[PDB]
């Protein structure tokens, strides 16, 4: 039921992000996780444990804090010849970096042959420019193939 | 020395942004062309005839009309595991699609051992969209590679 929402109304949502979700499917059911911070992916689910519409969420291992990184309520796809980049906007803001925006997941899914899914890798982040910052990361599977 | 502007006051840059236009600085001398448009790209370079600092144009063969799909200016510039993105904003306006607003291009560059820099093709244009449409292209290179 709860699903992404691309940018649009209902209606004027671009036909290609539509057929990249649909595409996606079967990935809807798992969960992605990597290790201080803990990093909690799902696609078009709820990765977090607040109901707050989190598709990607910073759990902080000392008092299991969780920051909410993305929210599958402002999602973006599109593909190239080996890869999908899927991105979650509408995080929680920043107290003091990047004017204190919300935050951001881009996540980078390349082509593996393999695996449906797997090598889920937090890359980096990005919380020293004005704007446009955000949390970079990875993962295999081999619906990014073509 | 005119170059890719990023997002900041100058000096006040993201370092990580920074740190990319350095590695790339042996393609600033190359000009990339695509094999009804043409296209055009140049990194932190004009890449245009009418010096209107584009990075990216878009050339209709049939008349010449030369379309600014980015801006140097308007720089971005990240990196993952073995692929760079390059983003010019600033492009030209659309008359009617995207709600108006100004073209872009996002170039992804993937490691490539074998050339310094080559394969430079369009992928597509998304203009189905009520806002962030963009164009996008890739291209091989040895530098994005770890
Ligand atoms: O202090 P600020 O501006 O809230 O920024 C916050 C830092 O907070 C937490 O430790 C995490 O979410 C980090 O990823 C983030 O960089
Ligand atoms: O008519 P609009 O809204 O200006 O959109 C314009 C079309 O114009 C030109 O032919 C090119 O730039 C196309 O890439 C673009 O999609
Ligand atoms: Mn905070
Ligand atoms: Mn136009």
């Not at 598709?55 to 804090?65: C, P």
Request: hydrophobic share 30%; charged share 25%.
């Amino acid at each position: 039921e709860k699903t992404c929402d691309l940018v649009g109304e209902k209606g004027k949502e671009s036909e290609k992000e539509l057929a990249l979700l649909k595409r996606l499917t079967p990935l809807f059911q798992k969960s992605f996780e990597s290790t201080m911070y803990s990093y909690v992916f799902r696609v078009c689910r709820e990765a977090g444990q607040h109901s707050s519409g989190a598709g990607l969420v910073q759990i902080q291992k000392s008092n299991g804090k969780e920051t909410v990184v993305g929210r599958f309520n402002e999602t973006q796809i599109f593909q190239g010849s080996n890869w999908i980049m899927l991105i979650y906007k509408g995080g929680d803001e920043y107290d003091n970096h990047c004017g204190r925006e919300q935050r951001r997941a881009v996540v980078m899914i390349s082509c593996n042959r393999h695996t449906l899914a797997d090598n889920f890798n937090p890359v980096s982040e990005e919380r020293g420019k004005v704007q446009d910052c955000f949390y970079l990361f990875e993962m295999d599977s081999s619906l990014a193939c073509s």
